Amino acid sequence: EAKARRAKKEMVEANLRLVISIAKKYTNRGLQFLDLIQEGNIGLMKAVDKFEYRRGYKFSTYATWWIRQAITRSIADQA
DNA sequence: CATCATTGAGCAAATGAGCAACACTATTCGCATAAGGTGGGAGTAGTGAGTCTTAAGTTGCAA
């Protein structure tokens, strides 16, 4: 279990540049920036929880959906 | 001697505000999306006077 968590932390630590890169889009919707980066961090955590590698795709395309889920979810109910 | 007004006394009829209990539906909430997308951006520019605080530079001075 601890080994698996080390792997998952390691992957998240890889994909932070992805999450700020997508985080540039929806900035000025009446919320602050680091709220977006943290929500997106949650979203990529969930995307790590739901990714499989034997599918054969690049991780980012699958991850994108969970990130927009977290962002648009968060600004949606935090209007 | 009779009687009634006149003071208590309480009631049915009626009604206004509920109550619980089921039963049904509107709304809300929470989860998903697969080729790929892996460092922000606005940030002011024409105050001045003072006062407290560090920080550093210098400088006697004594063992």
Numbering used by the authors: 369 to 447
What sentences appear in the manuscript?
Through its engagement with RNAP, Q renders RNAP resistant to terminators. The Q protein of bacteriophage 21 (21Q) was characterized as sharing a conserved mechanism of action with Q proteins from other lambdoid phages. To investigate how Q renders RNAP resistant to terminators, and to visualize sequence-specific interaction of Q with QBE, we determined a crystal structure of 21Q at 1.45 Å resolution and a single-particle cryo-electron microscopy (cryo-EM) structure of an intact 21Q-engaged arrested complex at 4.08 Å resolution.
Nascent RNA from +6 to+15 forms a 10-bp RNA-DNA hybrid with the template-strand single-stranded DNA (ssDNA), while 5’ 5-nt RNA threads into the RNA exit channel. The structures show that two 21Q protomers (QI and QII) bind to the direct-repeat QBE site. QI has a large conformational change of a short helix, H2, which is detached from the main portion of QI and moves 30 Å away from its original location. The loops L1 and L2 connecting H2 to the main portion of QI also move along and form a ring-like structure with H2. As expected, the mode of interaction of 21Q with QBE subsites—binding of the second α-helix (H6) of the HTH motif in the DNA major groove—is similar to the mode of interaction of σR4 with −35 element. The main portion of QI sits on the exterior opening of the RNA exit channel and interacts with β' dock, while the ring inserts into the RNA exit channel and interacts with the zipper, lid, zinc binding domain (ZBD), flap, and β C-terminal region (β CTR). Taking advantage of the flexibility of the flanking linkers, the FTH moves 30 Å relative to its position in RPo and binds to a groove on QII.
